[PDB]
Amino acid sequence: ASATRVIQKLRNWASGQDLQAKLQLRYQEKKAVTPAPPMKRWELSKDQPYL
Amino acid sequence: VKQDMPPPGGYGPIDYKRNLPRRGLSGYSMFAVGIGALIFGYW
Amino acid sequence: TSVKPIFSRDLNEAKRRVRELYRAWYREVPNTVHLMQLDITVKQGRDKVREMFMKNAHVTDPRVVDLLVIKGKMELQETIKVWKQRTHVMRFFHETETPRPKDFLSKFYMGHDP
Amino acid sequence: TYKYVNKKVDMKSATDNAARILMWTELIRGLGMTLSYLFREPATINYPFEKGPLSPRFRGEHALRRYPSGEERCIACKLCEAICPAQAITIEAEPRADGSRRTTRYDIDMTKCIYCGFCQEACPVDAIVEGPNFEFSTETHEELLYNKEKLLNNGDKWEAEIAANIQADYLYR
Amino acid sequence: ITHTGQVYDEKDYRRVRFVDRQKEVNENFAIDLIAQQPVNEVEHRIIACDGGGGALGHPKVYINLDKETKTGTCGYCGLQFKQ
Amino acid sequence: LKKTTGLVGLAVCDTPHERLTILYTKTLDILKHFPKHAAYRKYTEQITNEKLDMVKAEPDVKKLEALLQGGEVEEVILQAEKELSLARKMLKWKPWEPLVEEPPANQWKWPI
Amino acid sequence: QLITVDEKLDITTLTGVPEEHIKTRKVRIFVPARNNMQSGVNNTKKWKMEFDTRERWENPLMGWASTADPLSNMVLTFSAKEDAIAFAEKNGWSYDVEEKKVPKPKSKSYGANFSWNK
Amino acid sequence: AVIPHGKGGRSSVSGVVATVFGATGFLGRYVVNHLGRMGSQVIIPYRCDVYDIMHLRLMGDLGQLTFLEWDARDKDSIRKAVQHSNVVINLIGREWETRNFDFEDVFVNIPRAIAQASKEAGVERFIHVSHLNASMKSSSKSLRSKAVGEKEVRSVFPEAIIIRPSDIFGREDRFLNHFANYRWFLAVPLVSLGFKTVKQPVYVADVSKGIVNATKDPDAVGKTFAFTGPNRYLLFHLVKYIFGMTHRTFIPYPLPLFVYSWIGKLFGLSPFEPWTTKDKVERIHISDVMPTDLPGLEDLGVQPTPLELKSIEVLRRHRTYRWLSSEIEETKPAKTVNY
Amino acid sequence: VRPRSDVTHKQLSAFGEYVAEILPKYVQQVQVSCLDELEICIHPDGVIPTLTFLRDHTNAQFKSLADLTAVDVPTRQNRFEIVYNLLSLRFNSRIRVKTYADELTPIDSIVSVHIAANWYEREVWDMFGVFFFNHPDLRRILTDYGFEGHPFRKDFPLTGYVELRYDDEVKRVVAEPVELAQEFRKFDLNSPWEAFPA
Amino acid sequence: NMTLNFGPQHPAAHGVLRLVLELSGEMVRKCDPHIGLLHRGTEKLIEYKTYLQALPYFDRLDYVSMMCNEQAYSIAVEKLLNIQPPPRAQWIRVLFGEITRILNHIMAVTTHALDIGAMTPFFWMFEEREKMFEFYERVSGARMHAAYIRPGGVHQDLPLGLLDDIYEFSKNFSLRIDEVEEMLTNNRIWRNRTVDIGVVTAEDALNYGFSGVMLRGSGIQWDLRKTQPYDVYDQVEFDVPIGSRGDCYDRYLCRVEEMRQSLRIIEQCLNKMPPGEIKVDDAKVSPPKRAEMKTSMESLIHHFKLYTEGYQVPPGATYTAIEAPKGEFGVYLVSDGSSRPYRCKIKAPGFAHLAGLDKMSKGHMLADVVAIIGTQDIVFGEIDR
Amino acid sequence: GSDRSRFLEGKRAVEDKNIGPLVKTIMTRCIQCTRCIRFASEIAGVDDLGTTGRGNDMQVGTYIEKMFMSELSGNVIDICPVGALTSKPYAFTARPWETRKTESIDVMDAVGSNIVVSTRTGEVMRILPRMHEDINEEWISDKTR
Numbered sequence A: 001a002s003a004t005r006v007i008q009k010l011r012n013w014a015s016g017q018d019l020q021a022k023l024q025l026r027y028q029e030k031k032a033v034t035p036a037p038p039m040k041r042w043e044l045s046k047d048q049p050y051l
Numbered sequence B: 001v002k003q004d005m006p007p008p009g010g011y012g013p014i015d016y017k018r019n020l021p022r023r024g025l026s027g028y029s030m031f032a033v034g035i036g037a038l039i040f041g042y043w
Numbered sequence C: 001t002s003v004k005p006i007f008s009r010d011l012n013e014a015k016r017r018v019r020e021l022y023r024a025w026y027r028e029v030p031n032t033v034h035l036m037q038l039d040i041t042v043k044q045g046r047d048k049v050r051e052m053f054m055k056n057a058h059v060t061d062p063r064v065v066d067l068l069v070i071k072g073k074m075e076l077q078e079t080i081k082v083w084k085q086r087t088h089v090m091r092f093f094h095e096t097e098t099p100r101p102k103d104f105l106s107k108f109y110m111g112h113d114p
Numbered sequence D: 001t002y003k004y005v006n007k008k009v010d011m012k013s014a015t016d017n018a019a020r021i022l023m024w025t026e027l028i029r030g031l032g033m034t035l036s037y038l039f040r041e042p043a044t045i046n047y048p049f050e051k052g053p054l055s056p057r058f059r060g061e062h063a064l065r066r067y068p069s070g071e072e073r074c075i076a077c078k079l080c081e082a083i084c085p086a087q088a089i090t091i092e093a094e095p096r097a098d099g100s101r102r103t104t105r106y107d108i109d110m111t112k113c114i115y116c117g118f119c120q121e122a123c124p125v126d127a128i129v130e131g132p133n134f135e136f137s138t139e140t141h142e143e144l145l146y147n148k149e150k151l152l153n154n155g156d157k158w159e160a161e162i163a164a165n166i167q168a169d170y171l172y173r
Numbered sequence E: 001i002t003h004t005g006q007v008y009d010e011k012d013y014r015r016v017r018f019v020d021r022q023k024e025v026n027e028n029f030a031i032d033l034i035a036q037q038p039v040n041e042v043e044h045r046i047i048a049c050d051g052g053g054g055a056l057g058h059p060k061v062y063i064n065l066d067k068e069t070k071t072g073t074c075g076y077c078g079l080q081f082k083q
Numbered sequence F: 001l002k003k004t005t006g007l008v009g010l011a012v013c014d015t016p017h018e019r020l021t022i023l024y025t026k027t028l029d030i031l032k033h034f035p036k037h038a039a040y041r042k043y044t045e046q047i048t049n050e051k052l053d054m055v056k057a058e059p060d061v062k063k064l065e066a067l068l069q070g071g072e073v074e075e076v077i078l079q080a081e082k083e084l085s086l087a088r089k090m091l092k093w094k095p096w097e098p099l100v101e102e103p104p105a106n107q108w109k110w111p112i
Numbered sequence G: 001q002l003i004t005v006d007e008k009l010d011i012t013t014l015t016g017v018p019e020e021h022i023k024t025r026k027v028r029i030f031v032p033a034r035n036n037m038q039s040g041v042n043n044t045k046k047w048k049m050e051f052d053t054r055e056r057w058e059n060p061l062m063g064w065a066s067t068a069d070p071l072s073n074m075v076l077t078f079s080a081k082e083d084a085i086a087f088a089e090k091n092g093w094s095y096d097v098e099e100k101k102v103p104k105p106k107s108k109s110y111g112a113n114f115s116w117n118k
Numbered sequence H: 001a002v003i004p005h006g007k008g009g010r011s012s013v014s015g016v017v018a019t020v021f022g023a024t025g026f027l028g029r030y031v032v033n034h035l036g037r038m039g040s041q042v043i044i045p046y047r048c049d050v051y052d053i054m055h056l057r058l059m060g061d062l063g064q065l066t067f068l069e070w071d072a073r074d075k076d077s078i079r080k081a082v083q084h085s086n087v088v089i090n091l092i093g094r095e096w097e098t099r100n101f102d103f104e105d106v107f108v109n110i111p112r113a114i115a116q117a118s119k120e121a122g123v124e125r126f127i128h129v130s131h132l133n134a135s136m137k138s139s140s141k142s143l144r145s146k147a148v149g150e151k152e153v154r155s156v157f158p159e160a161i162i163i164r165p166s167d168i169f170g171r172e173d174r175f176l177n178h179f180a181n182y183r184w185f186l187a188v189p190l191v192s193l194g195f196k197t198v199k200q201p202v203y204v205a206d207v208s209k210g211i212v213n214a215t216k217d218p219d220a221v222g223k224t225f226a227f228t229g230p231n232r233y234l235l236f237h238l239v240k241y242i243f244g245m246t247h248r249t250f251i252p253y254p255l256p257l258f259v260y261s262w263i264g265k266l267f268g269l270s271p272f273e274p275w276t277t278k279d280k281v282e283r284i285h286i287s288d289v290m291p292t293d294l295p296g297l298e299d300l301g302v303q304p305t306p307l308e309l310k311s312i313e314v315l316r317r318h319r320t321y322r323w324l325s326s327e328i329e330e331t332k333p334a335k336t337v338n339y
Numbered sequence I: 001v002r003p004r005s006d007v008t009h010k011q012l013s014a015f016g017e018y019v020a021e022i023l024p025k026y027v028q029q030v031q032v033s034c035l036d037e038l039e040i041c042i043h044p045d046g047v048i049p050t051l052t053f054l055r056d057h058t059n060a061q062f063k064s065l066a067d068l069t070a071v072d073v074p075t076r077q078n079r080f081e082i083v084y085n086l087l088s089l090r091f092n093s094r095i096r097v098k099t100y101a102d103e104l105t106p107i108d109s110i111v112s113v114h115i116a117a118n119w120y121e122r123e124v125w126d127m128f129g130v131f132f133f134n135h136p137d138l139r140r141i142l143t144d145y146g147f148e149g150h151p152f153r154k155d156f157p158l159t160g161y162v163e164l165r166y167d168d169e170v171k172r173v174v175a176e177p178v179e180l181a182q183e184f185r186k187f188d189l190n191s192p193w194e195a196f197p198a
Numbered sequence J: 001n002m003t004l005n006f007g008p009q010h011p012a013a014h015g016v017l018r019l020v021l022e023l024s025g026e027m028v029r030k031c032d033p034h035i036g037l038l039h040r041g042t043e044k045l046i047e048y049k050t051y052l053q054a055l056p057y058f059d060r061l062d063y064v065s066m067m068c069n070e071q072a073y074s075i076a077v078e079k080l081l082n083i084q085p086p087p088r089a090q091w092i093r094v095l096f097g098e099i100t101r102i103l104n105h106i107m108a109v110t111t112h113a114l115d116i117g118a119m120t121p122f123f124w125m126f127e128e129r130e131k132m133f134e135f136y137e138r139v140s141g142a143r144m145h146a147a148y149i150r151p152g153g154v155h156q157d158l159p160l161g162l163l164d165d166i167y168e169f170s171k172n173f174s175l176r177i178d179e180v181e182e183m184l185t186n187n188r189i190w191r192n193r194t195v196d197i198g199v200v201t202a203e204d205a206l207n208y209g210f211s212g213v214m215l216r217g218s219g220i221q222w223d224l225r226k227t228q229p230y231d232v233y234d235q236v237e238f239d240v241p242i243g244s245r246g247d248c249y250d251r252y253l254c255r256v257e258e259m260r261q262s263l264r265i266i267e268q269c270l271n272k273m274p275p276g277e278i279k280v281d282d283a284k285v286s287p288p289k290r291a292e293m294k295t296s297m298e299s300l301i302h303h304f305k306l307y308t309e310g311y312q313v314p315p316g317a318t319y320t321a322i323e324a325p326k327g328e329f330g331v332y333l334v335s336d337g338s339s340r341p342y343r344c345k346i347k348a349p350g351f352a353h354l355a356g357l358d359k360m361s362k363g364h365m366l367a368d369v370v371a372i373i374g375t376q377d378i379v380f381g382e383i384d385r
Numbered sequence K: 001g002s003d004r005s006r007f008l009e010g011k012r013a014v015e016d017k018n019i020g021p022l023v024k025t026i027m028t029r030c031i032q033c034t035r036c037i038r039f040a041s042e043i044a045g046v047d048d049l050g051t052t053g054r055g056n057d058m059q060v061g062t063y064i065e066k067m068f069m070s071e072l073s074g075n076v077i078d079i080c081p082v083g084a085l086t087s088k089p090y091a092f093t094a095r096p097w098e099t100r101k102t103e104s105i106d107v108m109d110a111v112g113s114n115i116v117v118s119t120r121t122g123e124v125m126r127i128l129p130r131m132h133e134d135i136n137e138e139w140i141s142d143k144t145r
Ligand SMILES: NC(=O)C1=CN([C@@H]2O[C@H](COP(=O)(O)OP(=O)(O)OC[C@H]3O[C@@H](n4cnc5c(N)ncnc54)[C@H](OP(=O)(O)O)[C@@H]3O)[C@@H](O)[C@H]2O)C=CC1
Pocket: H021, H022, H023, H024, H025, H026, H027, H028, H047, H048, H072, H090, H091, H092, H093, H094, H095, H101, H106, H129, H130, H131, H132, H164, H165, H166, H167, H168, H169, H174, H175
């Protein structure tokens, strides 16, 4: 930390997000039988189907 | 005897998603400032 | 008895392959002594190939002979290419190790278990 | 549940693309990130003056402890030798005149040792412990081989901290 | 010198090692330290010996201080107990 | 119709129902030479017949993909001709014949 | 088609063993006896063949035992006497098999010792 | 003593505790090698910096080699080195008598004190080393001095094996490298045009094994073995041969030894290890003594090894980009002149 | 107690018969272990045929080769027990096909069936000495270039017979017969008392 | 066809790899990787050691992924004994299983860049790594090579306070992954050296046994953690990051995405880890607590026998595979009734991947080979074993 | 046996006595199995060792302290499965897993009793009997061990 409020703003502007919130300084016939039922195809993730 | 366990009520939430910000000057605006600079320089 | 064959039905055919490998090594010894800058004499080297070839001269089992050349050929490849750097080749000559006498009196004088 | 990492011509779209391609924008973005850290406090520690934190279970360097009275704890059961994965510990024993059972020779070969910490685990009297010190680099290979006298001496030097460390972690074990 | 008196000798071919470098030996040898320990008097016929501190001691054993003739000695601490 | 299959190398096969019907009917044909009571012939004929019965029955590829599983239809095509290749291979191999030889005695006894 | 060989499988030439340790090493095929200390007999079941013991000189620097014989710690376990003999023949090591000796049946009965007569 | 147990290789014991004072140098590198290979306890006194002594550490098992700080002008240092050794080998020698050590010191003065103490200690045998053909009236102060010493060493440690070796050639040899190193001088100045200079060269290893064997052999006591070689040579063939393997031209140029002793003086003047010296020059142009009767390498068990056999390894570094790939048997071996 | 799902034990058993009927010729034994795993055992000649059927059969697609290994039971006449473990991404299942090979009776190579085996087969030759016919390039992979002997064989000494050190005289690394400074202490660990099989 | 040994000591080549190459021009005609420069005998040594004293070998097999490897042997030994770990231990193993995945991906993505030439991502994330190591140390005692996950559960409960810190870190690590993306994910130059380099088809990836991100990157959906759940990876919810147009860039994106998904799994584990014991209660398999062995005779006997002799696993053989960060890590552990194993072939995701180097780097430049060794996360310990 | 103990009560202790210079009787170890009292009466005719008392303080030691002096004496060590009485010379020199066991022949006496020589790191640590039905059936003399 010890950003001084101006190095921090250059840091925030250059990065484009707030590092202050997430700092680098930690502080205090028969059936053919398959081996098992065919796997169901996976579902699209609902929270983010694509990145 | 105490066992390290999640705090009561559970921990808070973490971010698991990219928060990369799509911030930029629009392209036309970008080119115009540049072309304007060359026009002034040429004059 | 009653054993399946690998590459040679009879010692005869197998011996054919040994001849080929010998030739291979014989033709190769000189090159190695030059591409590895080994400090040995080609004549000496070919002698080594002979010795190593002869060391297993007793075998009369078709199958055993066939594997022996497979293995022999593999060694050649490595040596043909530079996969086996000099340290590897010279090891064949057992240059650093001190030779042990086989005379009984000699062993008696030196080792508890001969 | 699966996710597609990289599944995916208006003038504006095309122009902006050209703006990026010819103005190298995505490259300038990267420079900003590094300039940002240049302003962050670096995380390095003065190594001799400040030391990277190690908690009580750190295995570090072997030591043989002694009872407060002054009787060395080891009673030569020799299962520390049995469970040593690397064959490092060599123990030979004989009844001391007292009649008690003690190790005539206890040699941990530290170069053979892979600091697993099972010996710490196995000892019934907990005579052999993984001491905190990690700085025992030695000029000669022989110094690394340790006999009973070096380990007992190592035990006496670090006993105060070893006792504190075992005090902190014994409930867990 | 040492506990079991290791004495690489004046004629050994190993005493060469300490030349210009000291040997590792121990003061406060343990052999004499428990001998320096007072005999723990007790009332009961048999007594325990956690080694002192329970989990931080030795597997607990019960010693029979039944004969004043002999002060029981826990095989782990070498502590003599005087009935 | 689709743009592409998930699998990188596989490419969309247009006329997929026709391509499958061609491959499925071929296999059935090759199997016709296998010995009559040969286990492979009875088992695979049953699997292949069910597959194309479904292929002929379903005119929608997306539902076709659900009915015989197979994920994308293109894969089912690859599996069918792979099987067609093995059917040709096994006729040469003649696996239906009796066991080559019994294992040596105690060859399969693990406790040792 | 198979070919015929009456040559005892000897594969000493393929195993890759130094000449000294194939011609000077005698291995003994024996069923391990039981440490009289314990009465369990689960370690007297499988045959083992063990190579002859060799030099174990003291090490000058630390006093640890030191051995120059590679085949010392190797004891292979074979289920039957016939199979173990086969291993020695094809590997070319000399063998001297020792017959298993199993405890003879012994007649015991609690009533018998209560006999004052005898 | 130390009963010899083991199979014969590293990590085995032979029972020879041996101080070897000049281990740091050319031959020492070899003496410690065999002694270490055999499993002998080797105490190497050193006054060179620890960085230089490192090459020695790699040779021998954990605890076989012990290094002690020692100063020649201090008798006490020699005293403690031989305290626990039973074999003392002396290889102390130099070619340029230095500011604070003159030939007497390096050859006669020091090597005496050493054996002297060794006796006080009770070492079984002492093996002093003096040059072959070190006549007490030879031309080089060195050879004269070396002889002077052998006389003295016999007084202090009577019957301390003495070995007088002939020119010694091995990687890092002077005899073989030095000539190859005359390349800078376009032509090669050789008295009598390199003739009238018969010399017999001995591989460094040959000399060593002998020395080591001398320690473990009873007959060696009170002997003056002279390791010589497998073939003699007029200096002419030697010089050319060398240049031959080095594949560098040869221009043997006659130059009076008179004037040349002066060239040696010039290099001798140089502060840093003169490349050549008045004495070295004389020694060079000093012919080797006859076989006489002195026993030899094969007597001590090591059959001499011909120069041509290993020359290729010693002279290889001096070749060029391509010449570096030529081998000795396609090359022509030079003729042998016994004279 | 592990959470066994009998649902599996049965389905895999049923496949085991399926395969046994489909290839009566090479399958010698088939069993679904209590650990819910199938281990068809095939005559060495059935290496090519049994694998291919599993790689390319609609009702049993076993596309990837998890591993090829060779336990060595010295007692067993056929010393090596080549074991091939295969996976089916389609049916989410696995099967192990294990054959037996003696030292000088080579097995066929499956590099054709699965190219994954190109390396593992070289690994089995280097460590155990089994030979694989029709292998594209069989040559030692893990051992040193000049190594003599097959290391994972139960009859090979752990420490081995050769070790390397640098020798000044010859200025080059040099093998010497192994001389160890503390031999491997061979603790005997088997207890003379067995455990009554459940 | 110029021949050249990439060289054992190559700043780029991870560890020591002699990649003999025949290069037509700068293009690489043939790639014959050599292996065994790190063979050490791990498979033979284990036969001479008891089950618990062979656990430390597994940490060394692929030590970037120190613990995840230990879980595979654990699971395998537990199956043979038909014992399963207690509920808290399972969550722990998934907690440290994932932390370990991050550690591997930070290694793989940042070391990939160092060979490419980007050096600042490595320093950025090695600081985060460092912080993670400290978790290992405060749980096991060792920064890496812990030996914490043993065959019957973990060794000792988490210190009183670790969970809270594995939170603070997790709460922030995301931003640290975010920062790297900025520089590389879209660098106008990362893409070029990575995109369309080493494309592997889907059918070919299954055929050469790739089994890892390498398969997932080609679009094949297979995560052994979802298909065949091990431990309690079933009770968590995560999304496998499947890829299309599989190439060095796509797979990378996948590894950055599993770093993201592992933070989702870690969060849960912290939110839902049960109160309980961390080792099986069968003194038969798990060593007795030290208070118990020092006060109860049956516990000393069980402590003495377990440490000196061993588990005595029932005779059998099993192949158990987990989803180690590199790919499918499996142990085929044949076992006689003895306390020491009989065979333990370690399947290394990496023996298969290297083999693919030839079929991936064809008609490629010297720099391409450097990029592809990176996209396979080759740790020579697992390949050489 | 069982995985854990339920004996929350206290333990007993007996008083170590002297049975001689060869057998160390740390008899607080004794499981009152009466093998010794048998061997000492049936295999060897000493008839000295006996049970003394009843209840949980039955101690199987000589009532008066008379040493167990007889040949065949050391066998008690091998026959007591508990380590109550064990060998005094081989008190604490080793531990059995380490001991490499080589099967050889007794040369001290002409019965040629079979014996197993237990060697650790190259010096013999103990010689204990190995069974030969005809010659020494599980027993060896006090001299040859
Ligand atoms: N090859 C040859 O030229 C021949 C040599 N010899 C004899 O063999 C012996 C060994 O030869 P080589 O190894 O080539 O000789 P080097 O010039 O290599 O020196 C040999 C050793 O003597 C030591 N030494 C030299 N001067 C002093 C000094 N003033 N005080 C203490 N130590 C000293 C050196 O140690 P440091 O350098 O650290 O002082 C070195 O270790 C010599 O003594 C020589 O007389 C005999 C015939 C031929």
